[PDB]
């Protein structure tokens, strides 16, 4: 049983007592604050709204549990029982909050308002920032989605250059991060964010999250194929690596199959086992069912280059229309070790320099894709910008002397299209002057109800690359 009264930073329990007396409105906003990563993919809030914020989230039992925990945690009575009982009694435990947000999947430059939060009942001035902690966790799917999309830009550039098209782009970066993230819940959230940009995942948890909270016309949003792990090779004994290979590719003779080849000696496995002993089992495979050789250790770029060099001398290589070398269609490579946005760039650039098409390879990333990210990468941040006290609205902000990068926006915010068609955030309620057309934010939550939502297919369309669009 999740309890929203226990889902905040401890000190926020004490804040109701700290605002100016007679404050009736607290209005706050989220941005990826300006400080690469010039634009962000807005994704993930719809999950939070539905799983944690909508409907009857306050009960008499949840109030008593919070009172009991906070009494001990603070060694004192500081919990706002009265305020939460008000919500329970007046709104049948539905939050009197309104959230406006940019559509999911939207790609927006840094430093723009992405969502706003305000209370809808003056008695609940304290509630806006109570839920800061839970809403700010949107940084994670935004950040995964964004960093995944930045890797797609890299892959698109180099695939276009070396092959002349983008065929298969959406399967070039596979999610291997299930084991490397910090929890099951994170696994589903992060896997779903990667699927905004790609279709290949081993993180099965993402599929159910998307089905429940977003939806796709297709039965599932992402796909995989059979593959070995080191245990299914090493179990055969060190002298029987050939036997394991032969067994695995025969068991999966008619579908694609990846086979990890570096248990003992990747270069031997490629040149002597695959390239000589078992070559007859590879060159007979369908283009729809290639063997995908998997190195998994050594310098990522050097190992890929050396594997391709070996395979190129044992198998028939062609020269595609762009002048780049291409393995036969029954043979590919996957690099699933040490991949993050930086090493991905190094590997594709290294391949290009050695005249190997990016058609030859795909990448898997795990920790780099889903875990090695923090809230500082995009400076995702929630701040109060407007309050009403004693009936007077006031524009508020922070502006720390030693760090102008932490300055926050002032007053009521709105998001607009500029005359050149770009985004701009207007501060101080200036959107009301109607000089920049309509506010692009939409009301997505009001008074315990989700009022606007997006399918996963729409989110993917919104998050497309300009090259894909053109």
Ligand X SMILES: O=S1(=O)NC(NCc2ccc(S(=O)(=O)N3CCC(N4CCCC4)CC3)cc2)=Nc2ccncc21
Binding-site residues from annotation for diphosphate: 179, 230, 294
Q: Where are the beta strands (DSSP E) in 254-404?
A: 257-260, 291-294, 318-319, 325-326, 331-335, 361-365, 380-389, 392-395
> Of 171-179, 261-269, 311-319, 417-425, which part binds ligand X (CB under 6 A)?
171-179
Closest contact distance (angstroms) between CB of 388 and a second copy is: 10
- Between CA 274 and CA 402 the distance in angstroms is 61
Please list, in sequence order, all residues whose beta carbon lies within 8 angstroms of the beta carbon of residue 444, skipping any fewer than 6 positions away.
Answer: 45, 46, 49, 99, 100, 101, 115, 450, 451, 452, 453
Nearer to a second copy, 81 or 439 (CB): 81
The single residue among 6, 7, 225, 281 that binds ligand X, judged by CB under 6 A, is 225
Among 31, 118, 202, 241, binds ligand X (CB under 6 A): 202
Binding mask 64-103 for ligand X (x = CB under 6 A): ----------------------------------------
- Residue 402 binds to a second copy (criterion: CB under 8 A): yes
Which spans in 354-421 are helix H? 367-370
Q: Does 42 bind ligand X (CB under 6 A)?
A: no
Task: Produce one character per residue of 45-74: b if its CB has 16 or more CB atoms within 10 Å, e if not.
Answer: bbbbbbeebbeebbbeebbeebeeebeeee
Secondary structure of residue 22 in the 3-state scheme: coil
185 lines the binding site for a second copy (CB under 8 A)? yes
Of a second copy, ligand X, none, which one does residue 2 interact with (CB within 5 to 8 Å by kind)? a second copy
Between 116 and 261, name the residue whose CB sits nearer to ligand X: 261
293 binds ligand X (CB under 6 A): no
Among 102, 260, 459, 463, binds ligand X (CB under 6 A): 260
Task: Give the footprint of ligand X on residues 405-464 (CB under 6 A).
Answer: none
| Pairwise CA distance, residues 158 & 382, whole Å | 37
C-alpha–C-alpha distance, residues 446 and 100, integer Å? 9
> Is 225 among the residues that bind a second copy (CB under 8 A)?
yes
The nearest distance, CB 439 to a second copy, in angstroms, is 23
- Region of 167-175, 348-356, 369-377, 434-442 interacting with ligand X (CB under 6 A): 167-175
Torsion of CA 47, 53, 59, 65, to 10 degrees: 80
Distance CA 245, CA 247 (A): 5
40: enclosing H helix or E strand: strand 39-41
Site mask, a second copy, residues 232-251, x = CB under 8 A?
Answer: x-xxxxx-x--xx--xx--x
Q: Which of residues 102-141 bind ligand X (CB under 6 A)?
A: none
Length of the chain: 470
The answer to whether the CB of 107 falls within 8 A of the CB of 153 is no
Which position among 37, 171, 397, 436 is part of the footprint of a second copy (CB under 8 A)? 397
Selected from 109, 298, 350, 393, the binder of a second copy by CB under 8 A is 298
C-beta of 376 vs 432, nearer to a second copy: 376
**Residue closer to ligand X (CB basis): 93 or 177:** 177
CA distance 445 to 135: 12
Contact 194, 206 (CB under 8 A): yes
Distance CA 7, CA 9 (A): 7
Do 290 and 299 meet the contact criterion of CB atoms below 8 Å apart? Answer: no
- Work out which of 403, 434, 435, 470 binds a second copy, going by CB under 8 A: 403
Nearer to a second copy, 244 or 424 (CB): 244
Query: Any contact of residue 368 with ligand X (CB under 6 A)?
Result: no
Binding residues for beta-nicotinamide D-ribonucleotide: 202, 294-296, 336-337, 367, 375
In the complex, minimum distance from the CB of residue 148 to ligand X, in angstroms, rounded to a whole number: 14
292 binds, among a second copy, ligand X, none (CB under 5 to 8 A by kind): ligand X
376 binds a second copy (CB under 8 A): yes
Q: Which residues are annotated as a binding site?
A: 179, 202, 230, 294-296, 336-337, 367, 375
Question: Where do breaks (C to N over 2.5 Å) occur in the chain, by preceding residue number?
Answer: 35
84: contact with a second copy by CB under 8 A: no
Sorted by sequence, the CB contacts under 8 Å of residue 67 that are 6+ apart come out as 79, 81
Verify binding: residue 223, a second copy, rule CB under 8 A.
yes
Residue span binding ligand X (CB under 6 A) among the ranges 3-11, 154-162, 239-247, 342-350: 3-11
Work out whether 9 is an interface residue with ligand X (CB under 6 A): yes
Of residues 259-278, which lie at the interface with a second copy (CB under 8 A)? 262-268
Residue placing its CB nearer to a second copy in the complex, 253 or 320:
253
Q: Do 135 and 58 form a contact (C-beta atoms < 8 A)? A: no
In our burial notation (b when 16+ CB lie closer than 10 A, e otherwise), range 190-221 reads bbbbbbbbbbbbbbebbbebbeebbebeeeeb
CB 406 within 8 A of CB 416: no
- The least distance separating ligand X from the CB of residue 296, rounded to whole angstroms, comes to 7
Residue ranges in contact with ligand X by CB under 6 A: 9-11, 168, 171, 174, 176, 200, 202, 223-225, 227, 256, 258, 260, 292, 294, 332, 334, 336, 362, 364
């Amino acid at each position: 049983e999740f309890n929203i009264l226990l889902a905040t930073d401890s000190y926020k329990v004490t804040h109701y007592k700290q605002y100016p007396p007679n404050t009736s409105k607290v209005y706050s906003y989220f941005e990826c604050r300006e400080k690469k990563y010039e634009e962000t993919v807005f994704y993930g809030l719809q999950y939070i709204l539905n799983k944690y914020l909508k409907g009857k989230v306050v009960t008499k039992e949840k109030i008593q549990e919070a009172k009991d925990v906070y009494k001990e945690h603070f060694q004192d009575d500081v919990f706002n029982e009265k305020g939460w009982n008000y919500i329970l009694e007046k709104y049948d435990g539905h939050l009197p909050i309104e959230i406006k947000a940019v559509p999911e999947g939207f790609v927006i430059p840094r430093g723009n308002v992405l969502f706003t939060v305000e209370n809808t009942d003056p008695e609940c001035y304290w509630l806006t920032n109570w839920i800061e902690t839970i809403l700010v966790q949107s940084w994670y799917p935004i950040t995964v989605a964004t960093n995944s999309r930045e890797q797609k830009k890299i892959l698109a550039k180099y695939l276009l250059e070396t092959s002349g098209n983008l065929d298969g782009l959406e399967y070039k970066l596979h999610d291997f991060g299930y084991r490397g993230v910090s929890s099951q819940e994170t696994a589903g959230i992060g896997a779903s964010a990667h699927l905004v940009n790609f279709k290949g995942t081993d993180t099965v948890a993402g599929l159910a999250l998307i089905k429940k909270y977003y939806g796709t016309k297709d039965p599932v949003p992402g796909y995989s194929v059979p593959a070995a792990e080191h245990s299914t090779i090493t179990a055969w004994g060190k002298d029987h690596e050939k036997d394991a290979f032969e067994h695995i590719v025969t068991q999966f003779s008619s579908v694609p199959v990846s086979v990890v080849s570096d248990s003992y000696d990747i270069y031997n496995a490629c040149e002597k086992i695959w390239g000589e002993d078992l070559r007859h089992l590879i060159v007979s495979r369908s283009t729809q069912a290639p063997l995908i050789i998997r190195p998994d250790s050594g310098n990522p770029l050097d190992t890929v280059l050396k594997v391709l060099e070996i395979l190129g001398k044992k198998f028939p290589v062609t020269e595609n229309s762009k002048g780049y070398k291409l393995l036969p269609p029954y043979l590919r490579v996957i690099q699933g070790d040490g991949v993050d946005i930086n090493t991905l760039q190094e590997i594709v650039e290294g391949m290009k320099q050695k005249m190997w098409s990016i058609e030859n390879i795909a990448f898997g990333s795990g920790g780099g894709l889903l875990q090695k990210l923090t809230r500082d990468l995009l400076n995702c941040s929630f701040k109060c910008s407007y309050v009403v006290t004693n009936g007077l609205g006031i524009n508020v902000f922070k502006d720390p002397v030693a760090d102008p990068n932490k300055r926050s926006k002032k007053g009521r915010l709105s998001l607009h299209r500029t005359p050149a068609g770009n985004f701009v955030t207007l501060e101080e309620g200036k959107g009301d002057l109607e000089e920049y057309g309509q506010d692009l934010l939409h009301t997505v939550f009001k008074n315990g109800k989700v009022t606007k939502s997006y399918s996963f297919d729409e989110i993917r369309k919104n998050a497309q690359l300009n090259i894909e669009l053109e």
